[PDB]
Write a protein that binds this DNA or RNA. Structure first.
Length: 324
DNA sequence: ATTACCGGGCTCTGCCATCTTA
DNA sequence: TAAGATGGCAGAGCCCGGTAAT
């Protein structure tokens, strides 16, 4: 009876919560009060708590014992309570979507057995907390898939390919094997692509391509190809460009296009752009801002070394002063 | 003294469909 | 036989600066 009343004083968005997990509002007993006190005990603010419950109401059905034990387990990896509060504020999901603290502990044990340092586990938990609410079996499937993928390519020891991939791509363990697989084949088919260069790309600059949802990478590449084609770039140039800078794939089509256009409207050549791909790191606002200042000075941009467009504020602002 | 090369940091959460489970 | 547990989807960059090269 008191549920809807307490949720209110807690400042919970009751309507949003009702829509997310209706079943929680039909339970006879709930522990919203204990949860609030528990989360307060560990630094969480009243607003954070309200936000947490609004998003994952089932949170209020956990007991003081489970909560405390789960938290303790996380503290085997994360060095402070505050670090755990921030993770839960980001997404309540990993912490609250399971009450199975045995599975959690097995996940921790299994990851250690994979050869991962506690520092790495901390990295995994902080970046991809949801790794730890996966079933052990799900985490096993991915690790196996990765070993199998490692040796199916030219890797001297798969067990170490796994750890490299996990370090560069903390999110790898919260992707389906279907998704990752599709992204590897995309890369393999689309480009060259010998195993040795595939490995490097995968454990390096192109690591997060493997986390890309279905058809997103193929579609992004096809737009890049078209856009660059219409601009007089050959296929080999496009390939070279994307491989020298796979981050470009993460941009939305319109953003990529808009960014190319905003540069070339100031008469920077497409050749200048793709030979200095990092200029594509700066936002359209930042590029426009700097382009104004540069042309606002003696600069012609057509013959200027445009690398500065993507330099840190400090280094850019310095070069700009000198330029006057 | 200045630019090139290059890696690292942030936050990547929140929804829904399908099973398990009691 | 409804909730809880679980898997898996779609989501759509920008910035800084240490160190090597010049």
């Amino acid at each position: 009876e008191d549920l809807l009343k307490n949720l209110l004083t807690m400042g919970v968005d009751i309507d949003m919560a009702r829509k997310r997990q209706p079943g929680v509002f039909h339970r006879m007993i709930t522990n919203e009060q204990d949860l609030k006190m528990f989360l307060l005990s560990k630094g969480a603010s009243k607003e954070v708590i309200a936000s947490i419950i609004s998003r994952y109401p089932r949170a209020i059905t956990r007991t003081p014992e489970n909560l405390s034990k789960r938290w303790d387990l996380w503290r085997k990896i994360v060095t402070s309570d505050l670090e755990i509060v921030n993770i839960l504020e980001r997404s309540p999901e990993s912490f609250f979507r399971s009450n199975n603290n045995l599975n959690l502990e097995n996940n921790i044990k299994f990851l250690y057995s994979v050869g991962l340092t506690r520092k790495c586990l901390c990295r995994l938990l902080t970046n991809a907390p949801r790794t730890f609410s996966n079933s052990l079996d799900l985490n096993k499937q991915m690790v196996e898939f990765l070993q199998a993928a490692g040796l199916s390519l030219g890797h001297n020891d798969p067990a170490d390919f796994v750890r490299k991939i996990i370090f560069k791509n903390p999110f790898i363990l919260i992707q389906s094997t279907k998704r990752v697989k599709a992204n590897i084949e995309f890369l393999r088919s689309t480009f060259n692509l010998n195993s040795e260069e595939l490995l490097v790309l995968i454990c390096g600059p192109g690591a997060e391509i493997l986390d890309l949802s279905n058809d997103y990478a193929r579609r992004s590449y096809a737009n890049i190809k078209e856009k660059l084609f219409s601009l007089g770039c050959t296929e080999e140039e496009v390939q070279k460009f994307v491989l020298s800078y796979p981050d470009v794939i993460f941009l939305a089509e319109k953003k990529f296009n808009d960014k190319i256009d905003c540069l070339m409207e100031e008469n920077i050549s497409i050749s200048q752009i793709i030979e200095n791909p990092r200029v594509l790191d700066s936002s359209i606002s930042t590029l426009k801002s700097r382009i104004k200042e540069l042309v606002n000075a003696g600069c012609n941009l057509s013959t200027l070394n445009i690398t500065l467009l993507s330099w840190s504020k400090k280094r850019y602002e310095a070069k700009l002063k000198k330029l006057s």
